[model samples]
Target: TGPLSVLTQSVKNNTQVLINCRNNKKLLGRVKAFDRHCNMVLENVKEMDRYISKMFLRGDSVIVVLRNPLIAGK
Candidate 1:
């Protein structure tokens, strides 16, 4: 009934996503893993001009998630 639920369903494992944090930081990567706690592990993360091999983001710090647009055709 809310945006969170919608996002959960839309974002699938291995899907590329962009995340905005409460601290005004942004991250872009593939969804390597996630849990009920909202915690997530992103692979090949890119923050601004920097690249990280792996990054762990705390649940509470997450503010927004931007899923990559699906390509035409399945």
Candidate 2:
């Protein structure tokens, strides 16, 4: 744990997700393989609002990617 990764933010409709990883490698690595639920979780997470969820890993660090909402079709 030397330096902390910066958290990125994004938004689509009213849904939002927080990706944790210093880069794409670490981010994709944390993703559970052959696990539908895990993948769904990530997808749904991106579509959530108000509350914030986390993706815990066995042995690794990641950055948070938060998102904001936009106005449209609501």
Candidate 3:
């Protein structure tokens, strides 16, 4: 996966780190590198690695089957 980092600023005296998946100059998608469950926490890379391990890879796409029921809108 081709990952790119983007810096973002917030008005509440905070900053955001966005992770973008790209191919050459085209942007495939972006994901906010922060903890969605916590308001003031960041997403740890180690935790992400662990969680992503559960996803199944189909060609170049990672398919997350059986979405977590705990999450309201995954």
Candidate 4:
């Protein structure tokens, strides 16, 4: 299995994820949905200092996903 597969398996449903985009943007949200292409729908989203209802994250623009610290070392 690859890194993506590992992520898919390890990240439990409704978990919080920290995403870093290509243009130095960052998002923190609860996982609502995701796919093989890495596209994701996040609910209760927050960016910078503001809160948003939801966000549709484009797969291609995502640079990294910071999983829970407890899972990071796995």
Q: How well does candidate 3 match the true structure in TM-score terms?
A: 0.17
Best by TM-score: 4
CA lDDT scores, all candidates in order: 0.72, 0.31, 0.23, 0.72
Model 3 scores worst on lDDT over the 10 consecutive residues at: 61-70
Provide the lDDT at 15 for model 4: 62
What lDDT tens digits, residue by residue, belong to model 1 across residues 1-74? 33355346545545677778887988888766676666887788899579999988787878778776558786
**Backbone collision count in every prediction?**
0, 3, 0, 0
lDDT winner between candidates 3 and 4? 4
Better of 1 and 2 by TM-score: 1
lDDT (tens digit, per residue) of candidate 2 on 48-72: 2332244444323334433334457
Task: Compute each candidate's TM-score over C-alphas.
Answer: 0.72, 0.26, 0.17, 0.73
Task: Single out the weakest 10-residue window by summed lDDT for candidate 1.
Answer: 1-10
Candidate 4, 12-71: lDDT as tens digits: 655667787888988888766678878887888888589989888888877777764345
Mind giving the per-residue lDDT tens digits that candidate 3 earns over 1-74? Answer: 12211212221223322222223221121223323221222322123234331221122322221111123474
